[PDB]
Amino acid sequence: QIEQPYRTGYHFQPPSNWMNDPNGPMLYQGVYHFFYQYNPYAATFGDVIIWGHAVSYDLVNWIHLDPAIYPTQEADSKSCWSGSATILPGNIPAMLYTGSDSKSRQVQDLAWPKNLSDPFLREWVKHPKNPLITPPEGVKDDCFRDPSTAWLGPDGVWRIVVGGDRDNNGMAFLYQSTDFVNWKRYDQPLSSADATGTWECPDFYPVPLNSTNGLDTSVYGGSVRHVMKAGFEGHDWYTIGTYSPDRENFLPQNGLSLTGSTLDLRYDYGQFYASKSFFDDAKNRRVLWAWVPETDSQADDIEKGWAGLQSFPRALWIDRNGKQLIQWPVEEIEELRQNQVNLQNKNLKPGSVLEIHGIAASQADVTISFKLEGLKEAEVLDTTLVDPQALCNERGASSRGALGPFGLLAMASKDLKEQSAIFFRVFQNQLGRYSVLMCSDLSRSTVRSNIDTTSYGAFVDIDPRSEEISLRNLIDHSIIESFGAGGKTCITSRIYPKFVNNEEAHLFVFNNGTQNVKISEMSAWSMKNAKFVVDQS
Ligand SMILES: *[C@H]1O[C@H](CO)[C@@H](O[C@@H]2O[C@H](CO)[C@@H](O[C@H]3O[C@H](CO)[C@@H](O)[C@H](O)[C@@H]3O)[C@H](O)[C@H]2NC(C)=O)[C@H](O)[C@H]1NC(C)=O
Ligand SMILES: *[C@@H]1O[C@H](CO)[C@@H](O[C@@H]2O[C@H](CO)[C@@H](O)[C@H](O)[C@H]2NC(C)=O)[C@H](O)[C@H]1NC(C)=O
Ligand SMILES: OC[C@H]1O[C@](O)(CO)[C@@H](O)[C@@H]1O
Description:
Family: Belongs to the glycosyl hydrolase 32 family.
Radius of gyration: 23 Å
GO molecular function: fructan beta-fructosidase activity
Enzyme class: hydrolase
Bound molecules: a molecule of 3 linked components (NAG-NAG-MAN), a molecule of 2 linked components (NAG-NAG), beta-D-fructofuranose
GO biological process, one term: carbohydrate metabolic process
CATH architecture of the largest domain: 5 Propeller
Helix content: under 10%
EC number: 3.2.1.80
């Protein structure tokens, strides 16, 4: 028997209880600070939510501290919800968050560390004038929240966006300030979308064109584009565009308004929400954090005593083509790699299954690259309007095609009674153009009941003719993070196989298509546990 077989070995999560939205991430005085929505009283959401707090020197190993922000004034007496961190000139980290006041309305509050001598910034003080911002005119009291990190314009004026909606229309309310204390709502929103519901945890930042690095939130220029990210209808969406501080205008590169359709982009196409990013000026990279909800039942959560994970922090940058964002786990994770098992120039005949031996199958980093032969044999299927998720749910690992399904079988039992299949399929339209589909088939991930086993999928923007299809998988017990084509397509999965309570997990490479595929190269590393020290009470 294993105790708590679903807890991760190297993903961030509190000692126990409920955790959701990541909060105020930042790098200050050489220390990485991480905060998060936390319920100290249960493994479910509750009436009292506070900011958990942990620190790290590498974004991998953490030290749990006491909660940093918790109700202490009328402006946040009922709860301290999501917010962001902004380090102001003079080296002072300023935290803006949404509080639930005594009248139960969402208002924006300010707080900053009370002792900058403390490397861990344990104590925080709140501004006497909170709330600093209250719901605009035609906005309901429970539809105005999640202030972003601020950016300083050339005119020396700070800008931030706050989520919410006006008549069910998603909003990124724009506010300005020079002292960071007195904010004035700009006439028009920075951006918005019809009938999307409340825009949660908006994030607005710049990315450098033709560069795989990150930028400080206040950078601007012709060689820079901006990303407008917002969570709604259950997912985190984003759009790349141009920002004009002068007239506070954001113009979508594709001229579209978010609709939450297959027309829009997402960071991750699986369980990924309330994502928030921060700039790391030490490594010159933008790091992204995201809450990964549980997909088991509430009863299961209460029973196992905890709920909620954070995705592994990943570097974020814009693709060479400037049409989408790329994600990749921060290099520090590589230090967890132990022994390695490799494979090269290996053919996977139709309907075959190859087991990877000598790896801790429940906690590993697996990378594989496929070399395809005879693309012309690809099934004909125009995918212009096709919904990749629907397609993956319709055709799992048991649905045999020409090119596909071929990929990985993670968190699988010896008998394969339970398995999580991350694979690819290749199609072509009538004109002979190819398209690639990436799937996370969770249909057979567990034999347990009351487990959301919905599958996730997305199309990968690569040309199968000139580049091999690559796939990286972060396997960590109840979570699997899949990165297709170097990070062009990301899918996070939560799985709860039953076998984990008795026998060990297994790892496999498979090809259930009728066509042959080859593994040019495959690398698998056992990942040692990340350290989590508690320094509370
Ligand atoms: C991909 O290759 C096979 C394509 O179908 C798939 O087979 C699965 O296992 C057997 C093999 O024919 C069949 O199972 C059927 O019968 C059992 C009887 O107990 C049912 O429980 C199943 O639901 C199903 O009706 C099916 O053909 C198929 N069934 C499933 C989903 O297990 C392989 O499993 C696939 N290989 C991989 C690695 O996924
Ligand atoms: C502000 O932070 C500093 C640094 O953490 C605190 O100083 C430490 O205090 C502990 C307990 O009193 C000592 O064991 C350490 O040796 C101190 N180190 C330093 C840097 O002097 C300081 O106490 C904090 N201020 C308050 C009011 O708590
Ligand atoms: O915990 C409450 C917080 O969580 C969210 O609903 C998103 O998951 C935020 O919009 C809010 O600030």
